[PDB]
Design a protein around this nucleic acid. Structure first.
Lengths: 58, 51, 185, 222, 159, 171
RNA sequence: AAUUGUUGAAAGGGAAGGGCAUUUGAUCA
RNA sequence: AAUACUGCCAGCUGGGACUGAGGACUGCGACGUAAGUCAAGGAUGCUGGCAAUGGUUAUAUGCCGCCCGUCUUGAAACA
RNA sequence: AAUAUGUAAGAAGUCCUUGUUACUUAAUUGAACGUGGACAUUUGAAUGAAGAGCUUUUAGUGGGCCAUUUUUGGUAAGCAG
RNA sequence: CCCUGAAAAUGGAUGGCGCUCAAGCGUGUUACCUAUACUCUACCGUCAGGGUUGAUAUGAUGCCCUGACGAGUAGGCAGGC
């Protein structure tokens, strides 16, 4: 009793019933996979500029 | 409550287009053009019948 | 026929009129519907829409949260509006004078406001004093802080609170959570 | 409470002023139309007389009607039809001629008939089956007040102004066309004139570009 | 059985062009890559380290990470009924700059220059592009260009 | 349909490299201007490297017969694609106008060789001004002096489905 | 109710039964 | 000059069929110098006949109409 | 080649000045994040959009077939793929 | 175009009757008939956009205005006997 193995029919219609959605983008992207040294120095620089801004403008 | 068709009801046509009265008065739908006469050039005349 | 580009006879997806059978709530909903229909202030429409929210969509607002909101610049002389229930927080010690309008008030929170020097009014009184919502500030509680939303969206490499009954050792801490017994999540 | 007469008189005065402006603008538009038509005719005459040929500018406006049902349609042509606002059979829309619009029409040519419209058929279409889109509703256009209210920001305030914007593509032609609901026409009164519609015009059918021949079909269907 | 590997069916894809084998020209290594730059991906057969997969050949992506000799590219891959982001690190060799973005910066600079110069007087800046509008009217003169009559040729049986 | 002669003059799109492109004129028998232009373009992109996207029509006009009330003999050279190959023919028609002659030729070919309008190509239409170069007997037989031929077996048309008298086919 | 006998009414050229509209017969506000 | 063909008329008019929804006024227009009128955000006036029309059922006529439920890509099946 | 296919066609942008870093550079030399400041008609190609985005739950489904075109096995098949 | 090639078993299929300057064959032009298709109108239901506590007067889940749509197995939801 053989049976049909594989077919791509109606798959495109099934995927298009719920429209294919582009990923939601944000102003600040994820910081994973980035160079650890760059991330550490970015953290230090961010702390420094936050402190400078707090000291300057209150 | 009901849509009346322009070009068949004169009241609605005049309401939509106030210029319709002037158009009808001046008979602008049948205007005689200027009686100007120009003759085609011999080149075009020969090209028309050139076989 | 029409080659429809969208679902036919589809509902708006929003809740019109409360699902509850609270007579007082329906009366308040009617009053705020009248306001939002015969006025132009978006505050009335926002309050009317929030009045239809469910219990899970209407989390309680604490007196500490009210004080934190009023601590903002220029918010001291404002009327707090909570569409729901206002609870009492024992972790705070100094409550400034204010005017909070909410549907239901916890006894402890009401006592705290009365002792501080404020008053507890209802939505009808708030509408009477400010028909257009002048000098008001709307407060909403944390909606994602419920314990039932942590389990939502569970999947590998997500860490989304697997649905369990008991907690401790040998309860979903074996293979599938450690690298020593195969794979980690 | 006796000020009703005062508001009535003020409303009448404002309406009369508005009608005066409408009449002046309509007269100007009619004069421009006559001048343009006569200028084209005499330009052709001088080109013929001076031993030359007058190459007319390509038409910038077309009318496209759907002559195919909503069944057995490939997905890309179906999407193009939806973007062109042709979801019912015997539905027509106006299209400004550009490269993008020409390539769009070349894709759904098998299911539509399009051609260059004339002022007379444009006016007849707008007068008879002219419907606007206000609050996502098909409100019929039986007065210039609605047109002015929904299009006064673009300088269009009357049905004649809308017709002018349709015939002559201008700065606000896109908004003028978007404001108008697609025209739902009926089957031709005198018939399609061909035994098989789903064949090209050169091949003897309604499918394909009809150029100036679209006017007769549009008036028969309207 | 069946074979679906990391380099399956890439015989004509991961292959150097005709008369273009050997080492790589010393220009790719001198290109500066920064975060946010849009680059294209084209695998090179000489270098087999950091080679991209078959799907990511010819795709265009933004740069999000900079390493010693590599950059990270974010590529939107369509799986099922959604687009998923893929952060893949590739060597400099199998990556080239995209000229569409450069044309965009050039158009932006010209856009700002025109916005300054034209608005110095304030008349019809028309900063937006337009498609190919239909041709206007024109007049052709048959002075030395008399139209020649053309007729279909008879069928011929040339061999 | 009722064929009409349209002469179309066209040219390539002007370029800065080659200003004032050459103009090509062709006469086509077609039902309408759209069909005439389509046939003009199709014939042009068979002898010259041109296309509709890389060209334009500078003129199109309708040719009317100079003397449509005079009976003429026309010789038409045609090339057509049959069920097996392409063949060239020369047919002689007798008609008062070129459009009528080519319509008769089209009907003749579609009825006798099963060639459709997509198959018949009009190579050339000419008028034989001397009644001595005609080489077809079916045309020569109608040029004889003092031509009198009767119409035997005349068939009448009745407006009623029943007739009370036996019909007669005299004439 | 299935089934059966009489009375009263209708139909019946190798089926009956139904729907779209009407004539005729019986009955009905 | 006329005529054939195409396109336009905010040119006129003859004949026939379907429809009468809405229910004191609200608006947009026209005529009328002005009263007032109108074919202008959905039909009224007059007159005639009866106090048969029409509802249910049976037969007849023109057309259409395969046996209910399940299995199945496929049922009415000689499943 | 055609068809099919990715990316860009802007305010999450561009430009001027200069604050931070434990990154880097011979070096205030580059990189990131910034503060202040300038550019709203025509916000940067056309068209469209009973609005778009996001979360929870779950019924049934996991034997298909046929039609145009491309095409495998087979001589062919209302054959299989 | 037609003819020989061209022979299968109950009695039968351009549906048949039948048709011969066809009612057969190719092409060209008009008129005519119709789908639950298209345009308008009347009614029902659904959805969307709104008005209506200035009342004696009640059902603001009530009333009214405008626009669009209405197929369907398994299955889901809602309103009702």
């Amino acid at each position: 009793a053989k049976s049909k193995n594989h077919t791509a029919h109606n798959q495109t219609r099934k995927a298009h019933r719920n429209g294919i959605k582009k990923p939601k983008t944000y102003k600040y992207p994820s910081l994973k996979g980035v160079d650890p040294k760059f991330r550490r120095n970015h953290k230090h620089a961010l702390h420094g500029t936050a402190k400078a801004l707090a000291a300057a403008k209150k | 409550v009901l849509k009346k068709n322009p070009l068949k009801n004169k009241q609605v046509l005049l309401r939509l287009n106030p210029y319709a009265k002037v158009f009808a008065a001046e008979k602008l739908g049948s205007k005689k053009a200027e009686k100007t006469g120009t003759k085609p050039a011999a080149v075009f005349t020969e090209t028309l019948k050139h076989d | 026929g029409i080659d429809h580009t969208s679902k036919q006879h589809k509902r708006s997806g929003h809740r019109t009129a409360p699902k509850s059978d609270n007579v007082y709530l329906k009366l308040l909903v009617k009053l705020y519907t009248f306001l939002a229909r015969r006025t132009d202030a978006p505050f009335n429409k926002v309050v009317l829409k929030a009045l239809f929210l469910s219990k899970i969509n209407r989390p309680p607002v604490s007196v500490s949260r009210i004080a934190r909101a009023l601590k903002q610049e220029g918010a001291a002389n404002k009327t707090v509006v909570v569409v729901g229930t206002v609870t009492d927080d024992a972790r705070i010690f100094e409550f400034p004078k204010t005017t909070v309008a909410a549907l239901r008030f916890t006894a402890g929170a009401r006592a705290k406001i009365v002792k501080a020097g404020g008053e507890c009014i209802t939505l009808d009184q708030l509408a009477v004093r400010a028909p257009k919502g002048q000098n008001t500030l709307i407060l909403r509680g944390p909606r994602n802080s419920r314990e039932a939303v942590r389990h939502f969206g569970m999947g590998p490499h997500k860490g989304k609170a697997p649905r369990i009954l008991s907690t401790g050792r040998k309860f979903e801490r074996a293979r599938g959570r450690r690298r020593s017994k195969g794979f980690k999540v | 409470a006796e000020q009703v007469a005062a508001e009535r008189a003020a409303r009448k005065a404002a309406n009369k002023e508005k009608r005066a402006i409408i009449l002046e603008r309509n007269a100007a538009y009619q004069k421009e139309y006559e001048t343009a038509e006569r200028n084209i005719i005499q330009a052709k005459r001088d080109a013929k007389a001076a031993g030359s040929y007058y190459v007319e500018a390509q038409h910038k406006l077309v009318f496209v009607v759907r002559i195919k049902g909503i069944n057995k349609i490939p997905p890309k042509p179906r999407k193009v039809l939806q973007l062109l606002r042709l979801t019912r059979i015997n539905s027509g829309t106006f299209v400004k001629v550009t490269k993008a619009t020409l390539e769009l029409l070349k894709l759904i040519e098998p299911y539509v008939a399009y051609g260059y419209p004339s002022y007379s058929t444009i006016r007849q279409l707008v007068y008879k089956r002219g419907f606007g889109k206000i609050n996502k509703q098909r409100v019929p256009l039986s007065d210039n007040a609605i047109i002015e209210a929904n299009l006064g920001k673009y300088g269009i305030l009357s049905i004649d102004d809308l017709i002018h914007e349709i015939i002559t593509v201008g700065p606000h032609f896109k908004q003028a066309n978007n404001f108008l609901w697609p025209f739902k026409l009926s089957n031709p009164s005198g018939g399609w004139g061909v035994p098989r519609k789903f064949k090209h015009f050169i091949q003897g059918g309604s499918f394909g570009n009809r150029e100036e021949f679209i006017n007769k079909l549009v008036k028969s269907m309207n | 059985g069946k074979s679906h590997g990391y380099r399956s069916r890439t015989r004509y894809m991961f292959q150097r062009d005709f008369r273009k084998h050997g080492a790589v020209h010393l220009s790719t290594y001198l290109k500066v890559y920064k975060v946010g730059d849009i680059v294209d991906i084209k695998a090179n057969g000489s270098i087999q380290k950091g080679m991209p997969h078959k799907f990511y050949q010819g795709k265009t992506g933004v740069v999000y990470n900079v390493t010693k000799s590599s950059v990270g590219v974010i590529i939107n891959k369509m799986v099922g009924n959604r687009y998923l982001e893929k952060r893949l690190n590739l060597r400099v060799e199998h990556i080239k700059h995209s000229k569409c973005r450069q044309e965009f910066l050039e158009r932006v600079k010209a856009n700002a220059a025109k916005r300054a110069e034209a608005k110095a007087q304030g008349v019809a800046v028309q900063l937006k592009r337009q498609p190919a509008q239909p041709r206007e009217s024109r007049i052709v003169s048959t002075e030395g260009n008399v139209p020649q009559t053309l007729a279909p040729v008879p069928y011929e049986t040339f061999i | 349909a009722h064929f009409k002669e349209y002469q179309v003059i066209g040219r390539r799109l002007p370029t800065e490299s080659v200003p004032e492109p050459k103009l090509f004129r062709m006469r086509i028998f077609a039902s309408n201007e759209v069909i005439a232009k389509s046939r003009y373009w199709y014939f042009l992109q068979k002898l010259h490297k041109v296309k509709k996207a890389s060209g334009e029509i500078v003129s199109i006009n309708q040719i009317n017969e100079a003397h449509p009330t005079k009976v003429k003999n026309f010789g038409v050279w045609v090339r057509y694609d049959s069920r097996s190959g392409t063949h060239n023919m020369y047919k002689e028609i007798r008609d008062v106008s070129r459009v009528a002659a080519v319509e008769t030729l089209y009907q003749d070919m579609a009825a006798r060789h099963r060639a459709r309008f997509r198959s018949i190509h009009i190579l050339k239409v000419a008028e034989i001004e001397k009644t001595a170069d005609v080489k077809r007997q079916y045309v020569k037989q109608f040029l004889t002096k003092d031509l009198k031929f009767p119409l035997p077996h005349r068939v009448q048309k009745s407006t009623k489905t029943f007739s009370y008298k036996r019909p007669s086919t005299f004439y």
